[PDB]
Amino acid sequence: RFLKVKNWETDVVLTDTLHLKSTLETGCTEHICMGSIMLPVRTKDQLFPLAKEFLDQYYSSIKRFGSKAHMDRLEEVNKEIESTSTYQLKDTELIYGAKHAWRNASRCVGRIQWSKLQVFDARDCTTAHGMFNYICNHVKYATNKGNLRSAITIFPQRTDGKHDFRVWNSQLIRYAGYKQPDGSTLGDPANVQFTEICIQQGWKAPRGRFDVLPLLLQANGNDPELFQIPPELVLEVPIRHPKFDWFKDLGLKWYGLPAVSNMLLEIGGLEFSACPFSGWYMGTEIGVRDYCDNSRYNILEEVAKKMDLDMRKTSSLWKDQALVEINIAVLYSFQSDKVTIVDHHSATESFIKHMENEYRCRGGCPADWVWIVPPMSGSITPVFHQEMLNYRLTPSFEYQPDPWNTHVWKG
Amino acid sequence: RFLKVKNWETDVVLTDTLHLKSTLETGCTEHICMGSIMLPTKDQLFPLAKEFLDQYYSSIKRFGSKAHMDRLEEVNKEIESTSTYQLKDTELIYGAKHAWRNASRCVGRIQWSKLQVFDARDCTTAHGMFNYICNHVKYATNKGNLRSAITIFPQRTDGKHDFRVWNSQLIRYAGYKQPDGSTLGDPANVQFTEICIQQGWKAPRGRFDVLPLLLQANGNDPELFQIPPELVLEVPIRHPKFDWFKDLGLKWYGLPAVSNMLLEIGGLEFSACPFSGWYMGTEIGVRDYCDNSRYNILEEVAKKMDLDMRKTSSLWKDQALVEINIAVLYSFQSDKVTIVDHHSATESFIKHMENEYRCRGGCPADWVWIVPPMSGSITPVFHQEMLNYRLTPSFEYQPDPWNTHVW
Numbered sequence: 076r077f078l079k080v081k082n083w084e085t086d087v088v089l090t091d092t093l094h095l096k097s098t099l100e101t102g103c104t105e106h107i108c109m110g111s112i113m114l115p116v117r118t119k120d121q122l123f124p125l126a127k128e129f130l131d132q133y134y135s136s137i138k139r140f141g142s143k144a145h146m147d148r149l150e151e152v153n154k155e156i157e158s159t160s161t162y163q164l165k166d167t168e169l170i171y172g173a174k175h176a177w178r179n180a181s182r183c184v185g186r187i188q189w190s191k192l193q194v195f196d197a198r199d200c201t202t203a204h205g206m207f208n209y210i211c212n213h214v215k216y217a218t219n220k221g222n223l224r225s226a227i228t229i230f231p232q233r234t235d236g237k238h239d240f241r242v243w244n245s246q247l248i249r250y251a252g253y254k255q256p257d258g259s260t261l262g263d264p265a266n267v268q269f270t271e272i273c274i275q276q277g278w279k280a281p282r283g284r285f286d287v288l289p290l291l292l293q294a295n296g297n298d299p300e301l302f303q304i305p306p307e308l309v310l311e312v313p314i315r316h317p318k319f320d321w322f323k324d325l326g327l328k329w330y331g332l333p334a335v336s337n338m339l340l341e342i343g344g345l346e347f348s349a350c351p352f353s354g355w356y357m358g359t360e361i362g363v364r365d366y367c368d369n370s371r372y373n374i375l376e377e378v379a380k381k382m383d384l385d386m387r388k389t390s391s392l393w394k395d396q397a398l399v400e401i402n403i404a405v406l407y408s409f410q411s412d413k414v415t416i417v418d419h420h421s422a423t424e425s426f427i428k429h430m431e432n433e434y435r436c437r438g439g440c441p442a443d444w445v446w447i448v449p450p451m452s453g454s455i456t457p458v459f460h461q462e463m464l465n466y467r468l469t470p471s472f473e474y475q476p477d478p479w480n481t482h483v484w485k486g
Numbered sequence: 487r488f489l490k491v492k493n494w495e496t497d498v499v500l501t502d503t504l505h506l507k508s509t510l511e512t513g514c515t516e517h518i519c520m521g522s523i524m525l526p527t528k529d530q531l532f533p534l535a536k537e538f539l540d541q542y543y544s545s546i547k548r549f550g551s552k553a554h555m556d557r558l559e560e561v562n563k564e565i566e567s568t569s570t571y572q573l574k575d576t577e578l579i580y581g582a583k584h585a586w587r588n589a590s591r592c593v594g595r596i597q598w599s600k601l602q603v604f605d606a607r608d609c610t611t612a613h614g615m616f617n618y619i620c621n622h623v624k625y626a627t628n629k630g631n632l633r634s635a636i637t638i639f640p641q642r643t644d645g646k647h648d649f650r651v652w653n654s655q656l657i658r659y660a661g662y663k664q665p666d667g668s669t670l671g672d673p674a675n676v677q678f679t680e681i682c683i684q685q686g687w688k689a690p691r692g693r694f695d696v697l698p699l700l701l702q703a704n705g706n707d708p709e710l711f712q713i714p715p716e717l718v719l720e721v722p723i724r725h726p727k728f729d730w731f732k733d734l735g736l737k738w739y740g741l742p743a744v745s746n747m748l749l750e751i752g753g754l755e756f757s758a759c760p761f762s763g764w765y766m767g768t769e770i771g772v773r774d775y776c777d778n779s780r781y782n783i784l785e786e787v788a789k790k791m792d793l794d795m796r797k798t799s800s801l802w803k804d805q806a807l808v809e810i811n812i813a814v815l816y817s818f819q820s821d822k823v824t825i826v827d828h829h830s831a832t833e834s835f836i837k838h839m840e841n842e843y844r845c846r847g848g849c850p851a852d853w854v855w856i857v858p859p860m861s862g863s864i865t866p867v868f869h870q871e872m873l874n875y876r877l878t879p880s881f882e883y884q885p886d887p888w889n890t891h892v893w
């Protein structure tokens with residue numbers, strides 16, 4: 076079958092055949108679309124088909140499909156599964172796997188970069204201290220003094236789901252949030268519950284507005300342990316504005332390195348429950364979401380006061396006006412300090428070129444429009460006008476529940 | 487089978503059951519989501535009729551009554567004999583209001599129950615259509631204090647006697663291709679403007695030429711009519727701070743009036759049913775003014791603002807976009823033409839979703855269309871999960887008439 080997508084701005088029509096390789100379910104049916112719902116221990120039986128499917132893909136990609144080396148590797152994996160109940164990826168398969176989970180991430184606007192991903196194999200890791208060390212190295216390598224490089228660190232796969240490696244942090248670097256007795260929040264409201272957990276585990280919290288949280292690390296199904304990332308490893312940018320001299324005195328800063336650590340990487344049926352990855356920021360993620368969401372730092376009012384905008388009616392568009400200035404400030408600040416960042420115009424434009432190339436060379440590019448379109452100035456970015464097909468390819472990154480809800484405590 | 491939607495800014499969880507009454511197909515499957523695709527007999531008619539009448543009699547608290555059963559029989563009789571049926575006025579009013587209520591792409595639905603319905607089922611000619619449409623325009627405009635209205639022309643019969651308004655909106659600006667290579671006026675309307683010219687319209691060939699109405703009755707060839715200029719309320723666009731803004735020569739019309747959709751009530755098809763409300767500001771300022779395919783004026787404004795257009799990262803587009811939208815809102819308000827901003831509309835839509843979940847068990851919503859084309863995440867709809875599904879009565883897109891019409 077063939078599915079067409081149209082760009083309403085350019086009239087360019089594309090043809091998807093890749094959706095025919097999709098197997099995982101979307102959440103949608105013929106009667107309901109769940110496109111804006113945020114969220115719409117294996118047995119030997121199902122595993123070899125997942126392995127076979129993955130290895131067939133890997134071997135096609137290297138132009139060795141049906142080779143003796145392909146057949147022997149199939150055979151070798153087959154045996155390993157019935158004997159040990161699982162199997163181990165070769166380094167080459169792992170690298171290919173992690174690259175393709177990124178390539179296949181339909182919510183990711185930055186995928187033009189997918190082939191340039193530094194893979195750190197951490198499958199020999201055994202303890203939380205071991206994990207701490209791997210993560211420091213990842214952070215120093217990725218940061219590269221502001222010339223950010225994409226990377227992923229891959230800890231041992233799930234075995235019986237009783238011995239999982241997990242990073243409890245949602246990102247490697249994030250600020251504490253503290254709910255005050257008067258119901259206000261100090262620091263980042265998104266991180267209050269995680270902060271409380273750190274505190275309970277024995278973290279001594281400075282109680283400021285931009286305290287970098289400690290890593291809470293679980294190895295081998297064991298209870299998690301606290302570690303402080305060396306501060307010299309955490310690159311931060313103070314936020315100022317090119318024209319507005321009072322902007323600096325808001326006291327804002329942000330970290331350079333966005334590093335998602337709470338997702339699950341699936342490759343050939345195997346589950347890597349600790350696979351922290353990192354790239355670099357698109358400015359709106361900080362300027363729109365982190366600073367301007369009502370549930371986050373919520374700084375719109377203060378910025379608009381200082382600009383002396385007419386705040387008496389929403390129709391002055393004071394919020395819109397302030398939002399732009401904050402985002403200019405974030406891009407200005409990062410660029411002045413030589414920390415990699417991309418603006419939402421440049422990123423969406425690169426994404427459309429990537430998407431077109433993927434259609435031509437791959438036969439499709441699953442994309443989730445709800446996530447791809449930036450959270451400001453949507454329709455003046457070319458993605459807004461681009462029709463997209465969303466489907467699930469493996470290898471893949473998947474959401475997993477927070478570990479403090481599932482973890483069996485040992486003490 | 488019972489489904490929850492969460493608002494991630496407020497943690498409010500709502501439970502949707504209304505979806506089980508969904509009937510038509512979304513485009514999506516378990517394997518593929520088509521959320522962002524713009525367009526994804528006697529036997530057939532009786533179930534559709536019955537489904538509607540049952541919902542109508544339920545709403546008036548008379549389900550399974552003498553009057554309910556009597557009507558089901560009456561309509562059944564009429565279909566068996568004539569192969570169609572006629573709606574009572576009351577049914578027609580309720581049906582139209584519900585087509586609006588069910589419109590999953592419409593942010594303005596808190597208003598759904600205040601809709602003036604103009605029954606034009608007695609209309610027979612294009613001149614009559616013109617009369618009805620002028621009356622709708624004048625009523626709806628109300629000298630700038632806009633009132634929602636729909637005018638409903640006769641229903642489809644055998645399908646070769648369709649009433650159609652060929653225009654996409656009742657009021658829209660012409661678009662002309664120039665020897666220059668560029669486009670003068672609204673590039674969205676080039677094709678339609680050609681059909682008007684090639685039907686005989688004397689085009690002023692200006693930047694803001696109000697198009698003639700092109701009206702089709704009883705499946706006949708369509709005819710041209712100029713809407714009395716004094717009925718077309720327009721707004722000159724100026725900025726509260728920028729003196730120079732007005733010298734761009736920008737204007738827009740006050741009345742948004744969709745005229746190319748099909749109203750389906752109880753299986754019956756109303757192929758000519760223009761309806762109108764009032765604007766949310768972004769529709770003019772973001773889409774009409776700044777779309778690359780539309781009037782595309784960001785470059786011009788940014789220049790007058792003397793912004794740094796060297797690099798995308800100065801956010802000069804975003805700066806200019808905000809000011810264009812400030813100018814749109816200020817102008818409409820200064821000339822007292824009803825308009826709503828995206829903050830106020832989306833805030834009203836969330837209160838309306840809540841009412842609909844409480845009072846009806848759901849509200850079908852298409853997040854891709856509901857979230858405004860600027861400043862998405864600082865409006866509350868951005869953080870609101872929505873379930874999209876198709877309920878009847880409904881408004882549906884229909885092919886452009888020129889492609890279909892037997893000429």
Ligand code: HEM
Nearest residue numbers: 177180182183184185188225226352353354355356357472
């Ligand atoms: C190199 C620069 C990158 C940029 C600019 C970028 C951009 C983004 C943005 C803006 C989002 C949505 C975030 C949000 O608004 O909440 C996102 C999502 C995502 N990206 Fe990227 N990305 C980059 C690199 C990567 C890398 C290296 C990976 C993994 C190898 C990755 C995988 C993902 C995944 C799995 C999501 C969905 C996250 C979720 O569901 O929470 N991206 N990307």
Ligand code: HEM
Nearest residue numbers: 586589591592593594597634635761762763764765766881
């Ligand atoms: C009262 C003020 C109203 C407001 C502020 C409003 C707002 C909007 C907006 C912003 C859109 C998307 C427009 C676009 O981006 O193209 C829309 C779509 C729509 N609205 Fe409304 N609306 C109003 C009244 C009405 C009325 C009176 C009806 C019908 C009786 C209606 C039915 C529809 C339909 C069917 C769509 C989808 C049109 C399509 O699919 O192209 N609306 N609404």
Ligand SMILES: Cc1cc(N)nc(C[C@@H]2CNC[C@@H]2OCCCCCc2cc(F)cc(Cl)c2)c1
Nearest residue numbers: 113114333334335352353354355356357360474
């Ligand atoms: C409930 C839920 C499901 C899901 N799949 N993801 C989430 C994550 C939520 C979605 N927005 C805020 C939070 O995202 C933070 C992690 C995603 C950051 C991805 C990202 C990576 C990168 F390298 C650069 C940039 Cl600009 C962004 C939540």
Ligand SMILES: Cc1cc(N)nc(C[C@@H]2CNC[C@@H]2OCCCCCc2cc(F)cc(Cl)c2)c1
Nearest residue numbers: 524525742743744761762763764765766769883
């Ligand atoms: C191919 C296609 C399908 C479809 N369903 N709608 C369309 C209409 C195109 C899509 N974007 C702009 C254009 O819509 C304009 C007409 C709808 C305006 C609805 C509207 C009514 C109103 F009363 C107030 C406001 Cl702010 C907006 C095209």
Ligand SMILES: C[C@H](O)[C@H](O)[C@H]1CNc2nc(N)[nH]c(=O)c2N1
Nearest residue numbers: 111112113445446868869870871
């Ligand atoms: C309910 C809705 O799906 C949700 O708020 C989404 C919308 N789009 C998004 N897009 C991105 N990139 N990140 C997000 O967190 C969200 N949130």
Ligand SMILES: C[C@H](O)[C@H](O)[C@H]1CNc2nc(N)[nH]c(=O)c2N1
Nearest residue numbers: 459460461462522523524854855
């Ligand atoms: C490709 C995508 O479906 C298309 O551009 C949509 C996106 N959202 C929209 N939203 C509204 N309100 N109006 C539109 O015309 C569109 N266009």
Ligand SMILES: [Zn+2]
Nearest residue numbers: 103108514519
């Ligand atoms: Zn869907």
